[PDB]
C-alpha cells in the first residue's frame, strides 16, 4: 500500500528478442513476424566521427549478419533502413509473435523497458518519457535494441527501441518507425539534452498518492486556478495542466481539489522533508499507475 | 562528453 | 550508466498464477503440477476478527471452491494445510510448470515479486528481505498469494507467498513450506515489527556503484578495519561485514577498498546531499545485482 | 493499526 515503480509483466515480449551481429558489432533485435528490427548503427563503427548511414547501408553484405534466437540461427533474406532502424527480413516467422501495435510515446507517458544483453532479456523496469525526450534508464554497452512496451488491454504496444546514452547519462531511443525521440541523432557526437520540465499531471498524481498514504504537511491553504498556474508553469520548468478529469476520484478519497495541490506545488518547487521518501517533486507516476496501485479499477 | 552508441 | 532497481523477466512464472476463490474470499495461488499453493486465510469466514484455522479447515467443503487459470476453471480433488498455506489438489496438470525449487531467503537477499490480483499478474518488481523479515512493497487487498521468486540457471526458486500488510505498511509472506517470515501471525492483530538494520554488504555494493557512476563527494580519507567497524555497526543499526571477497572486483575498477567505504559509511550515518539519487544509505542492491548493471557477467 | 490480511 506504498508506492513502487513497477513493470508490467514481460512474458509476452521475452520470446521476441534476438541477438544481431554484424562483423565486429553485436546488439539486440526485436523479432516480429518474419522481420528483425534493430538499431542501424550495428552496421557501422565510429568512435568520434559522424557516420554516413546511406553509405554504410550500400556497402552492406547480407552474409556478414549473424542473427540468433537463443542458440538457433535465423537466415537473413534482406534488409532495408527505416529512420534509425534496420528492417531485416529473415527466413521464418516468430511463432511467439504477440498481438501488437506500434505507438509513439508523448512526454509524461510511462512505459516498460525489457533490458537485454546479447539477445536475451535480463531485466525489466518501468520508465517515464521526460519532456526532453530522454529516459532515466540503466543500460550499458551492448544494450541497444532493448525494447520498450506498454500492454494496453491484451495488446502489446511497442514504443521504444534503445539507441544511445547521451554524454550526460540519459538514455535515448527511437520508436519502431525509426524516428529518434527528440530529434537526437544516432551519432557519437556531443549532444546536450534540453531542459526537462516536470510533467505536472504526474506530480499531481504523486501528491495525491502522498495524501492517500499519510504525507500532508506540504498541503497549502491557498488555491490557484489552472489558468493562473499555467501562466506560471512554463517559466518554472513545469508543464501546463490540460486535463483535470483524471483527478476527481483522487479529490474524492482525499477531499483536496486540484487547485489546492497547484498551490502547494508553487511552494515546493524547497531543504525540507521527504514526501514519500522523495526530496524533490517526481513526475515518474502517471494518474493511471497511481490508481492501479491504490485501487485497481 | 561524447555520446555512447551502445 | 544508471542504477535502477530491476526485476528479472517474469515470463516463466506468469503462466503459474491462478485465482483461488472460497466463499466471499478471493486471492491468488500458485499452480505447479497438479497442485495449487495459496494462503490459508482464503477459507476464514471473516478476516477482521481472529481466525481459528483448525475450525475453518474442518467445516470446509470443496464444492465451495472456485479456482481458475484465465477463464478455464479447475476442479478441486483434495485440500491439506501446511503452515500458513493450503495445498490444493486439482484434477488438471499445468503443462506450463517450469523447473522449480523452494528456497527460504535470508535477510539481505534480493528477489522478485510478481504482484497479482484476481489470479492475474499485474506488475513485476524487485525487493530485498529486511532484517525484521519484512519487505517494502506495493500490495493491496486481493494481492495475497503473489509469489516471490528468483531465476537461477533456468531453475525458478520460489521463496515467498504474500500474506498480509502490517500496521506500518511493511509486507509479510510465508515461504512455500508454509512458515511465516519472522514468526509473524496471519491474524488481524496489532503486530509491531522489530528494528530494521541495513545489510552493510549491500550498502557497500551500492557505494561502489555510486563511485562508478562518478559519485564521489562522500568518500572519506581515513579508513577503518573490518573488525573495528563491526563493533560500531551493531549499535548503529547495521549488520556486521563478513565476506570481503564479494567486492574483490569493484575495488580494482575504482581504486578504493572496503576499508575506505567503511570509514565513509560511518560519516554518512547525512547532510542534505544525495548519492545516485538516494538521500540515505540503501541496502536493497546485492553485489550480484550491481555487477550486472555495471558490467553484465 | 491492526494488520490487514490481503
DSSP string computed for A260-285: HHHHHHHHH------BTTBSS-----
Element (DSSP H or E) covering residue A13: helix A11-14
Judge whether C41 is closer than 8 Å to chain D, CB to CB. yes
Asked whether the beta carbons of A50 and A7 are under 8 A apart, the reply is no
Q: Is A53 strand, coil or helix?
A: helix
Domain identity same for A178 and A222: no
Domain identity same for C205 and C280: yes
Question: What domain range includes position C226?
Answer: 200-294
Domain identity same for A157 and A116: yes
Residues of C with CB below 8 A from D2's CB?
48, 167, 188-190
Interchain proximity A140–C293, CB inside 8 Å: yes
Interchain proximity C2–A137, CB inside 8 Å: yes
Instruction: Flag whether B touches A (3+ CB pairs, 8 A cutoff).
Output: yes
Number of inter-chain CB pairs under 8 A, A vs B: 42
- Angle C12-C18-C21 from CA coordinates, rounded to 5°: 165
For residue A83, give the nearest of A181, A192, A218 by alpha carbon. Answer: A181
Instruction: For C145, list phi and psi in degrees, rounded to 5.
Output: 95, -10
CB-nearest to A124 from C2, C124, C274 is C124
Asked whether the beta carbons of A159 and A148 are under 8 A apart, the reply is yes
Q: How many CB atoms lie within 10 A of CB C190?
A: 10
Q: Is A147 strand, coil or helix?
A: strand
Q: Give the three cell numbers for residue C23.
A: 466463499
Cα distance between residue C12 and residue A138, in whole Å: 23
For residue A230, give the nearest of A279, A197, A195, A268 by alpha carbon. Answer: A197
User: SS3 string of C229-297?
Assistant: HHHHHCCCCECCCCCCHHHHHHHHHHCCCHHHHHHHHHHHCCCCCCECCECCCCCCCCHHHHHHHHCCC
Cα distance between residue C271 and residue C250, in whole Å: 26
Judge whether C12 is closer than 8 Å to chain A, CB to CB. yes
Cα distance between residue C242 and residue C23, in whole Å: 50
Residue of C nearest to A114 (CA): C9
For residue C99, give the nearest of C33, C152, C150, C155 by alpha carbon. Answer: C155
Gyration radius of chain D's alpha carbons: 5
Sign of CA dihedral A215, A220, A221, A226: negative
Cα distance between residue C43 and residue A201, in whole Å: 42
Instruction: For A89, list phi and psi in degrees, rounded to 5.
Output: -75, 130
Read off the CATH number of the domain in which A2 is found.
2.40.10.10
Q: How many CB atoms lie within 10 A of CB C284?
A: 22
Q: Give the three cell numbers for residue C162.
A: 504474500
Sequence-ordered list of residues with C-beta below 8 angstroms from that of A23, at least 6 positions apart, any chain: A64
Q: What is the DSSP string of A217-247?
A: TT--S----HHHHHHHHTTTTB------GGG
Sign of CA dihedral C255, C261, C262, C264: positive
Domain identity same for A271 and A246: yes
User: Closest approach of chain B CAs to the CA of A55, in angstroms?
Assistant: 18
Cα distance between residue A262 and residue A256, in whole Å: 11
A19-41 b/e with 16+ CB inside 10 Å = b? bbbbeebbbbbbbbeebbbbbbb
User: What are residue A38's DSSP bridge partners?
Assistant: A86
Sequence-ordered list of residues with C-beta below 8 angstroms from that of C263, at least 6 positions apart, any chain: C220, C222, C223, C224
Judge whether A279 is closer than 8 Å to chain C, CB to CB. yes
- What single-letter DSSP state applies at residue A188? S
Domain identity same for A172 and A229: no
Cα distance between residue C148 and residue C129, in whole Å: 11
Domain identity same for A150 and A282: no
Q: How many CB atoms lie within 10 A of CB A102?
A: 13
Cα distance between residue C92 and residue C70, in whole Å: 14
CB-count exposure of residue A291 (10 Å: 0-12, 13-18, 19+): middle
Asked whether the beta carbons of A3 and A276 are under 8 A apart, the reply is yes
Instruction: For A149, list phi and psi in degrees, rounded to 5.
Output: -145, 155
Instruction: Flag whether D touches C (3+ CB pairs, 8 A cutoff).
Output: yes
Q: Which other chains touch chain D, taking contact as 3+ CB pairs less than 8 Å apart? A: C
Instruction: For A266, list phi and psi in degrees, rounded to 5.
Output: -65, -15
User: What are residue C156's DSSP bridge partners?
Assistant: C100, C151
Sequence-ordered list of residues with C-beta below 8 angstroms from that of A154, at least 6 positions apart, any chain: A99
Q: How many CB atoms lie within 10 A of CB A181?
A: 22
What are the Cα distances from residue C116, in Å, to A130, A296, C27, C141, C296?
29, 11, 9, 10, 29
| C7 assigned to some structural domain | no
Instruction: For A182, list phi and psi in degrees, rounded to 5.
Output: 70, 5
Judge whether A189 is closer than 8 Å to chain B, CB to CB. yes
Domain identity same for C174 and C208: no
Interchain proximity A117–C11, CB inside 8 Å: no
Technique used to solve these coordinates: X-ray
For residue A90, give the nearest of A40, A8, A143, A19 by alpha carbon. Answer: A19
Domain identity same for A213 and A147: no
Residue of B nearest to A26 (CA): B6
Asked whether the beta carbons of C21 and C43 are under 8 A apart, the reply is no
For chain C, the maximum distance between any two Cα atoms, rounded to a whole number of angstroms, is 69
- What single-letter DSSP state applies at residue A194? P
Q: Which other chains touch chain A, taking contact as 3+ CB pairs less than 8 Å apart? A: B, C
Domain identity same for A186 and A217: no
Residues of A with CB below 8 A from B1's CB?
167-168, 190
User: What are residue C100's DSSP bridge partners?
Assistant: C156
| C230 assigned to some structural domain | yes
Q: Is A38 strand, coil or helix?
A: strand
Sequence-ordered list of residues with C-beta below 8 angstroms from that of C255, at least 6 positions apart, any chain: none
Percent composition of chain D: helix, strand, coil (DSSP 3-state, to 5): 0, 35, 65
Element (DSSP H or E) covering residue A123: strand A120-128
Instruction: Flag whether C touches A (3+ CB pairs, 8 A cutoff).
Output: yes
CB-nearest to A10 from C11, C274, C292 is C11
Gyration radius of chain C's alpha carbons: 22
Cα distance between residue C76 and residue C67, in whole Å: 8
Residues of A with CB below 8 A from B6's CB?
27, 139-144, 162-165
Q: Is the backbone of residue A167 left (phi > 0), alpha (psi -120 to 50) or beta?
A: alpha
Sign of CA dihedral C256, C258, C263, C265: positive
User: What are residue C80's DSSP bridge partners?
Assistant: C87
Mutual orientation of helices C226-233 and C258-268 as an angle, nearest 10°?
30
Torsion of CA A13, A14, A19, A20, to 10 degrees: 0
For chain A, the maximum distance between any two Cα atoms, rounded to a whole number of angstroms, is 69
> Helices in A98-189 by DSSP H: which ranges?
none
Element (DSSP H or E) covering residue A139: none
Asked whether the beta carbons of C18 and C76 are under 8 A apart, the reply is no
User: What are residue C113's DSSP bridge partners?
Assistant: C125, C148
Q: Is A126 strand, coil or helix?
A: strand
| C60 assigned to some structural domain | yes
| C189 assigned to some structural domain | no
| Residue after which a domain boundary falls, among C148, C183, C218 | C183
Q: What pairing do the DSSP bridges indicate for beta strands C155-165 and C100-102?
A: parallel
Q: What is the DSSP string of chain C?
A: ------B---HHHHTTEEEEEETTEEEEEEEETTEEEEEGGGG-S-SSS---HHHHHHT--GGGEEEEETTEEEPEEEEEEETTEEEEEESS--TTPPSEEE-PPPTT-EEEEEEEETTEEEEEEEEE--TTS-B-----TT-TT-EEEEEETTEEEEEEEEEEE-TTS-EEEE-TTSPBGGG--SSSS--------B-HHHHHHHHHHHHHTT--TT--S----HHHHHHHHTTTTBPPP---GGGHHHHHHHT--HHHHHHHHHHH------BTTBSS------HHHHHHHHT--
Read off the CATH number of the domain in which C218 is found.
1.10.1840.10
- What single-letter DSSP state applies at residue A183? G
Asked whether the beta carbons of A65 and A172 are under 8 A apart, the reply is no
Q: Is D3 strand, coil or helix?
A: coil
Residues of D with CB below 8 A from C184's CB?
3
Element (DSSP H or E) covering residue A250: helix A248-254
Q: Is A107 strand, coil or helix?
A: coil
Residues of C with CB below 8 A from A293's CB?
123, 138, 140
Domain identity same for A4 and A147: yes
Domain count, chain C: 3
Report how far Cα C96 is from the mean position of its chain's Cα atoms.
24
| C276 assigned to some structural domain | yes
A52-80 b/e with 16+ CB inside 10 Å = b? ebeebeeeeeeeebebebeeeebebeebe
| Residue after which a domain boundary falls, among A194, A213, A242 | A194
Domain identity same for A207 and A187: no
Q: Give the three cell numbers for residue C158.
A: 520460489
- What single-letter DSSP state applies at residue A9? -
Cα distance between residue A56 and residue A186, in whole Å: 14
Element (DSSP H or E) covering residue A22: strand A17-22
Asked whether the beta carbons of C154 and C100 are under 8 A apart, the reply is no
Domain identity same for A285 and A255: yes
Asked whether the beta carbons of A29 and A36 are under 8 A apart, the reply is yes
| Residue after which a domain boundary falls, among C134, C153, C183 | C183
Q: After which residues does chain B break, using C–N > 2.5 Å?
A: none
Element (DSSP H or E) covering residue A155: strand A155-165
- What single-letter DSSP state applies at residue A148? E
Amino acid at each position: 500500500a506504498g508506492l513502487r515503480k513497477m513493470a508490467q509483466p514481460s512474458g509476452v515480449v521475452e520470446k521476441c528478442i534476438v541477438r544481431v551481429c554484424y562483423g565486429n558489432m553485436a546488439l539486440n533485435g526485436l523479432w516480429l513476424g518474419d522481420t528483425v528490427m534493430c538499431p542501424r548503427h550495428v552496421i557501422a563503427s565510429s568512435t568520434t566521427s559522424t557516420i554516413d548511414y546511406d553509405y554504410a547501408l550500400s556497402v552492406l553484405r547480407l552474409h556478414n549478419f549473424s542473427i540468433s534466437s537463443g542458440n538457433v540461427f535465423l537466415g537473413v533474406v534482406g534488409v532495408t533502413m527505416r529512420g534509425a532502424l534496420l528492417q531485416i527480413k529473415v527466413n521464418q516467422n516468430n511463432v511467439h509473435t504477440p498481438k501488437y501495435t506500434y505507438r509513439t510515446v508523448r512526454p509524461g507517458e510511462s512505459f516498460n523497458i525489457l533490458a537485454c544483453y546479447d539477445g536475451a532479456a535480463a531485466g525489466v523496469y518501468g520508465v517515464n518519457m521526460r519532456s526532453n525526450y530522454t529516459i532515466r534508464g540503466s543500460f550499458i554497452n551492448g544494450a541497444a535494441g532493448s525494447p520498450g512496451y506498454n500492454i494496453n488491454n491484451g495488446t502489446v504496444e511497442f514504443c521504444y527501441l534503445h539507441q544511445l546514452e547521451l554524454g550526460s547519462g540519459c538514455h535515448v531511443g527511437s520508436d519502431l518507425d525509426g524516428v529518434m525521440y527528440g530529434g537526437y541523432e544516432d551519432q557519437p557526437t556531443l549532444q546536450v539534452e534540453g531542459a526537462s520540465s516536470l510533467f505536472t499531471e504526474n506530480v499531481l498524481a504523486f501528491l495525491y498518492a502522498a495524501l492517500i498514504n499519510g504525507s500532508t504537511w506540504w498541503l497549502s491553504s491557498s488555491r490557484i486556478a489552472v489558468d493562473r498556474f499555467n501562466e506560471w508553469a512554463v517559466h518554472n520548468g513545469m508543464t501546463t495542466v490540460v486535463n483535470t478529469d483524471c483527478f476527481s476520484i483522487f479529490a474524492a478519497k482525499t477531499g483536496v481539489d486540484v487547485q489546492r495541490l497547484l498551490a502547494s506545488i508553487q511552494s515546493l518547487h524547497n531543504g525540507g522533508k521527504q514526501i514519500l521518501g522523495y526530496t524533490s517533486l517526481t513526475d515518474e507516476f502517471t494518474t493511471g499507475e497511481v490508481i492501479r496501485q491504490m485501487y485497481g479499477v | 562528453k561524447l555520446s555512447d552508441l551502445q
